[PDB]
Subunit: 430 residues, 4 copies
C-alpha cells in the first residue's frame, strides 16, 4: 500500500555515506551518546516522528536515535533545506524517509503525514524544528495527541509557539526547550549562523561581501552572529530592532541602529533574523539600490513580502535554483534568495557539523528524558536539566583540545562548590 | 565628637565638581531618575549606607539618591579605588564621606563604621559592592539587622556571598542582585572592562600590548571583555577556565584554552577575572618571563599570591604608586600592579561614565523597590523587575541616537506581544 | 580542420549569460573601460591569447577586450578552475574557448596550443596568469617571440618568473607587472583571498571554522588575507614565515609564528600561501591530528607533497570532485583538497566579481599600453602607470558610494599638490 | 655663561631612570645597536643636535647615541610632548637637555637654539622629527649648513617638507627619509597610534569609546591604526579621504567614507591624522553634538581651527592640563584636547617602548650612514638601505618569540634566492 520512503535519487546513497562518516568525525557529542546508550538502548519501544531539514547532520542524529533503540520516520521542515545525498543514504539505511530538495508546499504536507504511522501503530514521540509536526497533529490529528509521550522543539519560532499553545490551553503534550539551551542558543544560533549565513549568500550570489552595506533585522543570537560575519568581511552592518537592551548591545558593539524605513536606502544586502512578519516591505524595495540582495535566515518565509515582488515587478527571471532577479518598475533589480525562505539551509548547507552536534546532543538527551521519565515532565514546555546542558559542552572539549583547569579542595572550599561538583548557577546568562 | 566626613583634600572639590559636571552629561539614566523622582522623593525617610569605590561616577549616583530624597553616608570598598576630587566634592556637597586613595586596612574598616549611624538613628538601607558592608553588620553589628530594610549588591562577589548567606540562613535581610541584571552584567562587566583594564595596564606600565601574550584566567563577562581588549591590540590571548561551556565559548572564539601551569611559561601580561583563590601561585611566578606584568581585575586580592612574592623575592622596588618591580631569586623581574587589587579602579579610573550609569540606574531602581515594596521582597536574594531592567537600556538609547523600530498591530498580533507592550521573555540570556 | 572552441557543455550558455549579466553590474571598472573605448576600439588589430582561469569574471574581461576591438583566443590556467557555464557563453558568443573543469594535464596544454594561431596569423599579444603561456612560447615556439608585442602577468608567481627569464636573458618580449599594482595586490591578493579561501574549504568540506587551528604558510598579501578570514570565524591561526618584517607583522597582529615542523602538530586546517616548493611534507602528515584538512592557495600545486600521500597512504577514497580522504599508516585521515592546487578557484568560484574587476581593469589597461604605446615598454618587466593605477580605484568609488573629499586652493597650496592634480608619491606602500 | 641644560625638575631623575631601565627591556633594537657599536664607537667626533619629543623612549635613543661615541644636545619637537622625569634623567646623566612639558611658543625656540653650539664648535649632524631643527637652520642660520653632514627625519610632515625643499633646491644637506622605512611606517605609524591615540583621549577625557561615532580624517598608516583602535572598542568609525585608493581601502574595510561637512553632524570623537590644515572648521563646530571631543594626531596643530573656537566660544573652562571645554553660542560644549597639537604625546605617553625601538633603531642606523659613509649620501633625501630595514625587524623577532623558518638549498634554488641570503624585493609594499 503506502510508501516505505520517498527521496530524490537513492543512487546518492554512497556519496552521502562518505559525507556522513566525515560528519560523524566532527560530531563528538552525538557519537558519545552512541557509545554510551547503544547497549542499554534507552529509547527502546519508541516510535519517533521528526520534522527537521533532512541534512547530512540529521542523518547522524537519526542513526543515533536508531542506535539507541528508537524507530524513526523522518521529514524535512523545508522544501529547499533537504540534502538529497544525506537522504538517499538514510533511505538506503532502511529508515523510511520522505524528503527531497524543492518539494511543493503540497508535497511538504504529504511527507509529514507519511511519518505519523509506523507498523506497531501510531507515533509516540515528536522531534520538531519549527512546530509544523506538533501543530499539524494538535489540529489535524487530535486523536494521536494521547499516544504521544513527548515533544522536542529545535528552533525559537517553534518554542515561542509552544509557549503560546500553553498560554492558550491548546498544548496537550509535554515539550522540552532545546533551543533555549545555552549549549544550543549560544552556539548554533550565534556561531552557527556566523558561518552558514554568508555561505548561503556566496554560493547563490557569489557577491563580494567587502564594501557592501548589509542591513540585519533583529539582534538576537542569530543577529549577533550574522552581523559579525558581514562586518568581519569588510561590510558596513546597520541593525534594526524593537528591544532596548538588544538595541543598546548592537550600538555598544559599533553597529548603527535605525529603522528599515531609513536603512533600506543604504543597504546592499538585507538579512532578516526576525521572528515575525513584514520585516521588508514593498515600500522598502522601492528604495533599495540596484541588484540589492535580499534574504531571510529566520525560520519561516514571511519576513520578506515575496508576494509584493511577484505582484509588482515588471519582470522576474530565475538565475538558477533558489535565486531570482526581479526588474522593478523603476529600473533597479532585486536578487531574491530562496524565495524568501531560510537562506543558510536553502542556498548553502546549514550550520557546520561541529556546531550541529551541540544541538542534536541536546535533542537526543531530550528524547531520552521525555520517553523515560514521563513523571519528570508534566504537560508544559520544560527546559533541559542544566546538568545535561553542561554535559553537551564537556563532550566537545576533547575534539578541540580544550584543557579545563581543576579546582583544588582549597578553592572548592573557598568558592563553596565541588572541586568535582557543579557550580554553574541558574542566573548565569552567558 | 564624631567626624562629619574623612577625605584626602577638601580643596580638591573644585576640580572634582568639574569632572562631575562632565560625567552627568554621560550618565543619562541617572539624570532621568532625577528628572522624574526628585519631587516625589521616593527614597524619603531613607538612611542609606553604601560601600562602593568613591569615584566621580559614584558621586553622581550618590547625589541622585539625595535628590530622590535619601540620607546618604558613604565609604569606598577599596583602599585604592577612591578618586579624591570625587570625594572632595561629595564632602563639600555636605555629604558625610569617609574615603581616600591609599588607606590602610585599619582605616578602611573605620571608614565603614562611620556610615552606620545617622542623626535620626542607624541605617535602614544598604548599597553594597563586594559584600563587605552587608557582612560587617551581619557578623559584627547583628543588632542593626532589624532596622535594615533591604540590600543592593553591585558585584558578582557580593551576589555569590549572598546566595551562600541564604544557603546557611545567615542572611537576615532581603537583597537584590543588581549584578545579574542584563543591563549591568553584559554591559558593565563585559564592556566596562573592555576599556578600563588596559587603561590601568597602560597608565601604570605604558607597555605595548600588541605582540605580547596575555593570559586571562576565567572567561566570564569580565573575561570575555578583557580578552577582546588585549586581543584587539595585537596580543595573543590564552584562556584558562574550569567550566566547559564557558571554555567551549573561548575555543569557539579563536582563543587557546589550557591551564595556568602550562601558560605561566608563555604569557607576558597576566589578568585574573576569576572570583576565587590562588589563580597565580609562586609555582608560576617562578616560570614567568622577565618583567611579566601581573594584575587582578576580579573584586578581591587573593587571586594573585602577592604573599609569596613579598616573602620570596630578592628585592622589591617601587617605580610609582601601585606599581612594583620584584626581583625574583632567578633574576627575572615581575611588575605587580596595585598589589593584586583591582587594576582598573586601582591604576586607572574604572569604567567610563556611560557604562557606569547603567549600573547606577539599576542601583537607584533597586533601593526604590526595597524601601518602597518591602512586601514584594522577603528575606532572600531577588532579581530586579525585568521591566525596570529594560528600562535602563531604554534610558540610554537616546544619547546614542539609537532609533528603535515599532511593531504595528499586524505584527504585534502575529508574534503575540504588545506593539507597545512587553515581549522580552525571561528565558532570554543575551 | 582545427576546432572553433572546446567547452564542457555549450548547453550551459544560457545559465552562464545570466551569471555574466549579474557580474557586469559588479565590475564597475571593466564596464567603464567598455563604455570608454568600445567606439575608439584601441585594441584593433591585436590578437590576444590569454591563460587565465576561464571563470565568469574572466568572461567579462574577454568580452571587454573584444568590445575594445580585439581578437581573442582563450584557455584556462588550471585544470579545475574553469567555470563551464561561463565558458559555454564565451563559446556561443562566437569566441574560441578551449577550457573546462577537470582537464587532464595532457589536455591542459592542447587547450593552450589552440589559442596560438588566428586566421590573420599567430598571436601578437599575451594575457597570462601563472607564466604558462609566456613560457610555452619562449621555450617551445621561439619563432613566435617576434610576433608578440607584449605580455600581461596576472599573478606573483608569473611576475616572479618574468623577473628571472630577464635576469637570465631569456625574456624576448616586454611584459607588464600587473600583480604588483596596488589596486590589485592589496585588493585582489588580500581581499579576494579573505573571502574565497574559506568559500573553498566550506563547499568542499563544510568544516566548522570556529574552534579549529588554522596553520598559514606565508604572510604575503595572500597570507594576511587568509589569516584574517579564518581568524574571524573563531579559528586559531599560527603563521610560518621566512621573512622578519612579515614575521614581525603576523606577530604584532596577535598571530603565533613558528615552523611547520612544530605547527603540523597543532594545526587542523593547513593553508599554503607560499610561492615555493615543499611547504608541507610527509614528515608533517605523520603528525597531523585526525582528518586534518590540507589545501593550497598559492598558484602551482607543489607546495603540498601530494606525491607522498599517494605513495604512502594506506588507502585513498574520493569523497567528491576535488576532495580526497587519505588513510595513513597510523590510522589518522587526511582530507586533501583540489589535489594540492588552487583551493578557491578549484573548489569554489575564485574571488568575487567586485575585487576581480580591479585586477581585470589593470589587465585591460596593460594590453592598451603594450599594444598601443610599445615605445614606452622596452623588453623587460614594467609597472603600470601609477596614474592608471589610481584610476582603477576611482572607477569603483561610486559603486561603493564612497564620497571622496576635495582639497581647496589653500590646502592644495599648503601641501604643494594640485587641488585637482596628483600627489600619491611612489614611496607610498599602502 | 650659557646654560648646561634646562629641565622642569632635576629631582625627577631617580624615577625617570627607573622608567628608563624598564623601557630598555622593551627596546631590543636600540640595545642591539649598543652591544655592537659602543666599543668601535662609530659616531666619534659627531656633535648631534636633535629635535624629538623628549620622552623616556628618546632618552634611550639618546643614550644609545652616546654609547656609540656621539656627542648630543637635545630639545623637544613639542611643547607638551616632553616627559619631565625622562628629561630630568638625561640632564642628571650629564647630557645638556632643554625641554619640559608646557613651554610657551617662545621657550620652544630658545631651547632649539641652545642645542646649536657645542664646546668643540657648532653641530655637524641633525636628527629631526617634524623638520623644525632642519628648517630653523636652513632659514635662520644658513651658516651652519656647511658644517652639518646629514639629516634624519622621524615623521611624515618633515619628510614631506624635505622632498619639498629639494624640489626647490633649498635643501643644502643630505637627509634620510627614516619615516618611510617599512619597519617604521607600517609599525610606528600604524601599530603605534593603534594604542597611543585612545590612551591620549582616555586619560584626558576618560570618556567611553563604545557606542560613540568617531570621525578619522585621512586614512594613512596613522588613520588605519586609529580607525582600528576606536573601532575595536565598540565605536562606529566614519572616514574622510581625498585619495581614491586609500578611500577604497577604508570602504572594503567596512568603514563609511564621506566628507567632514556631512560627518561633523554625526561624530562624537573627532581625530585628525591628515597632514594638512583646515580639517575641522568652525563651520563644523556649530553642528557638532554636545560636548564632542576634538583632537589631532597629525604632527602640527592646524588641522583643527583652534583660533576659531578661541574667538567664537562664549566661554572656555580648563578641565585640567591640555583639556578644555568650550562653550559655543548654541549652548553646546566642545572638549578640545592638547590645544590642537599631538594628542597621543600631549595627553598620553606616546607610543609604547617596543614600537619606538624599531623607529629608533632606524634613527641610529641613519646617523651611522650619514656620518660615516657620506660619499654614499649626496645632497637630497634618501631611503635607509633595505638590508638595514630588514635588520631592524629581525632584531626584534627574538623578544617576541617569533620563530622564522629557513629556506633549504632545494627551495632557495627553486625560488632563486639565497637560503641564507636576501630576497625582499623592492616592489614589495607590505
Ligand atoms: N537559519 C537557521 O539556520 C536558524 C537558526 C536559528 C534560529 N532560526 C530562526 O530565527 C528566529 C529566532 O532568532 P534567534 O533565536 O537567533 O533570536 P531571538 O528569537 O532571540 O531574536 C528575536 C529578536 O528579534 C527582534 N525583532 C522582533 N521583531 C522585530 C521586528 N519586527 N523588527 C526588528 N527586529 C525584531 C526581537 O526584539 C528580538 O530581540 C526564529 O524564527 C528561528 O526560527 C533559524
Ligand atoms: N573590576 C571590575 O570592574 C569588576 C567588574 C565586574 C565584576 N568584578 C568582580 O569579579 C567577579 C565577577 O566576574 P564576572 O561577573 O565577570 O564573572 P563570573 O563570576 O560569571 O565568572 C567567573 C568565571 O570564572 C571561572 N573560574 C572560576 N574559578 C576559576 C579558577 N580557579 N580557574 C580558572 N577559572 C575560574 C568560572 O568557571 C566562571 O566561568 C566578582 O569577583 C566580582 O566581584 C569586578
Ligand atoms: N588563489 C589565488 O587567488 C591567488 C591570488 C594571488 C596570488 N596567488 C599566488 O601567490 C603567490 C604570490 O603571493 P601573494 O601576492 O599573495 O603574496 P607574496 O608573493 O608577497 O607572498 C610571498 C610570501 O610567502 C613567504 N614564503 C616564501 N617561502 C616560504 C617558505 N618556504 N615557507 C614559509 N613562507 C614562505 C615569503 O617570504 C613571502 O613573505 C604566487 O604563487 C601567486 O601565483 C594566488
Ligand atoms: N603623533 C604621532 O604619533 C604621529 C605618528 C606618525 C605620523 N604623524 C603625522 O601624520 C602625517 C602623516 O601620517 P602617516 O605617515 O601615518 O601617513 P600619510 O602621510 O600617508 O597620510 C596622508 C594621508 O592623509 C590624507 N589627507 C590629506 N589631506 C586630507 C584632507 N584635507 N582631508 C582628508 N584626508 C586627507 C591623504 O590622502 C593621505 O592618504 C605627518 O604629518 C606626520 O607628521 C604623527
Ligand atoms: N546543518 C543543519 N542541520 C540540521 N539542522 C540545522 C542545520 N543548520 C541549522 N539547523 C537548525 O535549524 C533551526 C531552524 O530551522 C536552527 O535552530 C538550527 O538549530
Ligand atoms: N567607575 C567606577 N566607579 C564605581 N564603580 C565601578 C567603577 N568602575 C567599575 N565599577 C564597578 O566595580 C565593580 C566591582 O568592584 C563592578 O561590578 C563595577 O560595577
Ligand atoms: N574569480 C576568479 N576569476 C578569475 N581569476 C581569478 C579569480 N579568482 C582569482 N583569480 C586570480 O587567480 C590568480 C592566481 O591564479 C590570482 O592572482 C587572482 O588574480
Ligand atoms: N613615545 C614616543 N617617543 C618618541 N617619539 C615618539 C613617541 N611616540 C611617537 N613618537 C614619534 O612622533 C612622531 C611624530 O611627531 C612619530 O613619527 C613617532 O615616530
Amino acid at each position: 500500500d503506502k510508501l516505505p520512503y520517498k527521496v530524490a535519487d537513492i543512487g546518492l546513497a554512497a556519496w552521502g555515506r562518505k559525507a556522513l562518516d566525515i560528519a560523524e568525525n566532527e560530531m563528538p557529542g552525538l557519537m558519545r551518546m552512541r557509545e554510551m546508550y547503544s547497549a542499554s538502548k534507552p529509547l527502546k519501544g519508541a516510535r519517533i516522528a521528526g520534522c527537521l531539514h533532512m541534512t547530512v547532520e540529521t542523518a547522524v542524529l537519526i542513526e543515533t536515535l536508531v542506535a539507541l533503540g528508537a524507530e524513526v520516520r523522518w521529514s524535512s521542515c523545508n522544501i529547499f533545506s533537504t540534502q538529497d545525498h544525506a537522504a538517499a543514504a538514510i533511505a538506503k539505511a532502511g529508515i523510511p524517509v520522505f524528503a527531497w530538495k524543492g518539494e511543493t508546499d503540497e508535497e511538504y504536507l504529504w511527507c509529514i503525514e507519511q511519518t505519523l504511522h509506523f507498523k506497531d501503530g501510531p507515533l509516540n514521540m515528536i522531534l520538531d524544528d519549527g512546530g509544523d509536526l506538533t501543530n499539524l497533529i494538535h489540529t489535524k490529528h487530535p486523536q494521536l495527541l494521547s499516544g504521544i509521550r513527548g515533544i522536542s522543539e529545535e528552533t525559537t519560532t517553534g518554542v515561542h509557539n509552544l509557549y503560546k499553545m500553553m498560554a492558550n490551553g491548546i498544548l496537550k503534550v509535554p515539550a522540552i526547550n532545546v533551543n533555549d539551551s545555552v549549549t544550543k542558543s549560544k552556539f548554533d544560533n550565534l556561531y552557527g549562523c556566523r558561518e552558514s549565513l554568508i555561505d548561503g549568500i556566496k554560493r547563490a550570489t557569489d557577491v563580494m561581501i567587502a564594501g557592501k552595506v548589509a542591513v540585519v533585522a533583529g539582534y538576537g543570537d542569530v543577529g549577533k552572529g550574522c552581523a559579525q560575519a558581514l562586518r568581519g568581511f569588510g561590510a558596513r552592518v546597520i541593525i534594526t530592532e524593537i528591544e532596548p537592551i538588544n538595541a543598546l548591545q548592537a550600538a555598544m558593539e559599533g553597529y548603527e541602529v535605525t529603522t528599515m524605513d531609513e536603512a533600506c536606502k543604504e543597504g546592499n544586502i538585507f538579512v532578516t533574523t526576525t521572528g515575525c512578519v513584514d520585516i521588508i516591505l514593498g515600500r522598502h524595495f522601492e528604495q533599495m539600490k540596484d541588484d540589492a540582495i535580499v534574504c531571510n535566515i529566520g525560520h519561516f518565509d514571511v519576513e520578506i513580502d515575496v508576494k509584493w515582488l511577484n505582484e509588482n515587478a515588471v519582470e522576474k527571471v530565475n538565475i538558477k535554483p533558489q535565486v531570482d532577479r526581479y526588474l522593478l518598475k523603476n529600473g533597479h533589480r532585486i536578487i531574491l534568495l530562496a524565495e524568501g525562505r531560510l537562506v543558510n539551509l536553502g542556498c548553502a548547507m546549514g550550520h557546520p557539523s561541529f556546531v550541529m552536534s551541540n544541538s542534536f546532543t541536546n535533542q537526543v538527551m531530550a528524547q531520552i528524558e521525555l520517553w523515560t521519565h514521563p513523571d519528570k515532565y508534566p504537560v508544559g514546555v520544560h527546559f533541559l536539566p542544566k546538568k545535561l546542558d553542561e554535559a553537551v559542552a564537556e563532550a566537545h572539549l576533547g575534539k578541540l583540545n580544550v584543557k579545563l583547569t581543576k579546582l583544588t579542595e582549597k578553592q572548592a572550599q573557598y568558592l563553596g562548590m565541588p572541586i568535582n561538583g557543579p557550580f554553574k548557577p541558574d542566573h548565569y546568562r552567558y
